[PDB]
């Protein structure tokens, strides 16, 4: 004798911020699902992030370009945050080419079909010279979780090009997750609760797909767990 | 006695890890004991983890 939760209205307050509600939850599973979902969402949500950067005139992170103000290291730190939605391929090579005085934002990236730049206004660098021109190639991969530069060396595979600049990959779009269990008094029923999952992300994963993917992963683990072959 | 000399500067980026020493301004000190996943940390009503 139980009920089951069905996805009801899923409101989006901002482009990043979304509240997803689950109305017909039996007493006691409010907290269980809240927490399980929170855990999976924060830990395992697959996302996209910049993996490596090649700028032409720069041998190593510490040198400096003519006509720019941020250091190469600061340009890398700025690129780490670049939020991009790739649909089909796993590894995309975006090309940024800008000249003249002005703040080079992400919108200047050469627009490919499969890539969506979530916030085109995101600043990358500031030029300061009429003839100063930067060209670069940003290689962005798909991945889950958090992999630093130093571990990825395992797959070195002849990293010979000294121009290649590795960036730490924070492969995770979910920034924040909270849940609220509140009594959802339906006119014909005794003890049912509503889950309100409030989630803030970098604007890559849509809420429905996030929740679905979490439920998928938990279900698979429980599948393995239910059967017991001693 | 020295024919020639070559100096080489390495720049090593050291990340925080277990065993480094961290302190406050009031004399509170300590060794970083374990790095936990974001999930494990206590979180406020709003959901921001400590």
For the domain that residue A128 is a member of, what is the CATH number?
2.170.120.12
What technique was this entry resolved by?
cryo-EM
**How close does chain A come to B12, measured CA to CA in Å?**
11
- Does residue A57 contact residue A68 with C-beta atoms inside 8 Å? no
- Does residue A185 contact residue A216 with C-beta atoms inside 8 Å? no
* Interface A:B, Cβ pairs < 8 A: 19
Question: Strand pairing partners for A171?
Answer: A145
In angstroms, the CA A150 to CA A167 distance is 10
Q: Which residue in A84, A47, A49, A82 sits closest to A169, CA to CA?
A: A49
Report chain B residues touching chain A, CB-CB < 8 A: 11, 15, 37-39, 43, 45-48
In angstroms, the CA A50 to CA A93 distance is 10
* Of A39, A62, A150, Cβ closest to residue B39: A39
In angstroms, the CA A102 to CA A132 distance is 10
Specify the residue for token string 């010979």: A160
**Burial status of residue A80 (CB atoms within 10 A of its CB: 0-12, 13-18, 19 or more):** middle
Is B10 strand, coil or helix? coil
Q: Which residues contact A65 (CB under 8 A, 6 or more apart)?
A: A55, A57, A58, A72, A132, A134
Q: Which residues contact A181 (CB under 8 A, 6 or more apart)?
A: A25, A30, A31, A34, A193, A194, A195, A196
A120 is in which domain, residue-wise? 46-171
Q: Which tokens is B18 given?
A: 């277990």
Specify the residue for token string 């065993």: B19
Question: Is the Cβ of A148 closer than 8 Å to some Cβ of chain B?
Answer: yes
In angstroms, the CA A217 to CA A48 distance is 19
Contact B43 A42 (CB under 8 A): no
Dihedral of CA atoms A61, A125, A53, A76 in degrees, nearest 10, equals 50
Q: Which residue in A142, A147, A138 sits closest to A204, CA to CA?
A: A142
- CA-based nearest residue in chain B for residue A180: B45
What are the Cα distances from residue A15, in Å, to A30, A101, A199, A200, A204?
A: 27, 31, 11, 9, 10
- Does residue A124 contact residue A106 with C-beta atoms inside 8 Å? yes
Q: Which residue in A72, A159, A201, A52 sits closest to A124, CA to CA?
A: A72
Contact A178 B46 (CB under 8 A): yes
Q: Where are the alpha helices (DSSP H) in chain A?
A: 29-44, 72-80, 207-226
Q: Which of B9, B10, B14, B39 to mutate to test the interface with A (most CBs of A within 10 A)?
A: B39
Is B18 strand, coil or helix? coil
Q: Which residues contact A60 (CB under 8 A, 6 or more apart)?
A: A72, A162, A165, B11
- Does residue A94 contact residue A138 with C-beta atoms inside 8 Å? yes
Is A123 strand, coil or helix? strand
Q: Which residue in A81, A187, A172, A132 sits closest to B39, CA to CA?
A: A172
Strands (E), chain A: 7-12, 17-26, 47-55, 84-86, 91-99, 102-105, 115-117, 123-127, 133-143, 145-147, 165-166, 169-171, 174-183, 192-201
Question: Is the Cβ of A17 closer than 8 Å to some Cβ of chain B?
Answer: no
DSSP class of residue B46 equals T
Handedness of CA B35, B37, B42, B48 (dihedral sign): positive
The resolution, in angstroms to one decimal, equals: 3.6
Is A192 strand, coil or helix? strand
Contact A39 B47 (CB under 8 A): no
On chain A, the residues whose CB falls within 8 A of the CB of B47 are 176-178, 198
In degrees and rounded to multiples of 5, residue A6 shows phi and psi of -115, 135
Strands (E), chain B: 21-23, 29-31
Q: Which tokens is A20 given?
A: 């997803």
């Amino acid at each position: 004798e139980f009920l089951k939760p069905r996805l009801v209205d899923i409101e989006q307050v901002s482009s990043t911020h979304a509240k997803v509600t689950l109305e017909p939850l039996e007493r006691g599973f409010g907290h269980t699902l809240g927490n399980a979902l929170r855990r999976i969402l924060l830990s395992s949500m697959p996302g996209c992030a910049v993996t490596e950067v090649e700028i032409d005139g720069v041998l190593h992170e510490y040198s400096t370009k003519e006509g720019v103000q941020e250091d190469i290291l600061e340009i890398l730190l700025n690129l780490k945050g670049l939020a991009v939605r790739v649909q089909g391929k796993d590894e995309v090579i975006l090309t940024l080419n800008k000249s003249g005085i002005g703040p080079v934002t992400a919108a200047d990236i050469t627009h490919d079909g499969d890539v969506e730049i979530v916030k085109p206004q995101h600043v990358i660098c500031h030029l300061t010279d009429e003839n100063a021109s930067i060209s670069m190639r940003i290689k962005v991969q798909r991945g889950r979780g958090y992999v630093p530069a130093s571990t990825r060396i395992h797959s070195e595979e002849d990293e010979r090009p000294i121009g290649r600049l590795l960036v730490d990959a924070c492969y995770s779009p979910v920034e924040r997750i909270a849940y609220n269990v509140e009594a959802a008094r339906v006119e014909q029923r005794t003890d049912l609760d509503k889950l309100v999952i409030e989630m803030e992300t970098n604007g890559t994963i849509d809420p429905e797909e996030a929740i679905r993917r979490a439920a998928t992963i938990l279900a698979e683990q429980l599948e393995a767990f239910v059967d017991l072959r001693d | 006695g020295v024919l020639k000399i070559v100096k080489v500067y390495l720049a090593v980026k050291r990340r925080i890890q277990p065993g480094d020493k961290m302190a406050g301004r009031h004399g509170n000190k300590g060794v970083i004991s374990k790095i936990n996943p974001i999930e494990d940390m206590p979180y406020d009503e709003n959901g921001t983890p400590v």
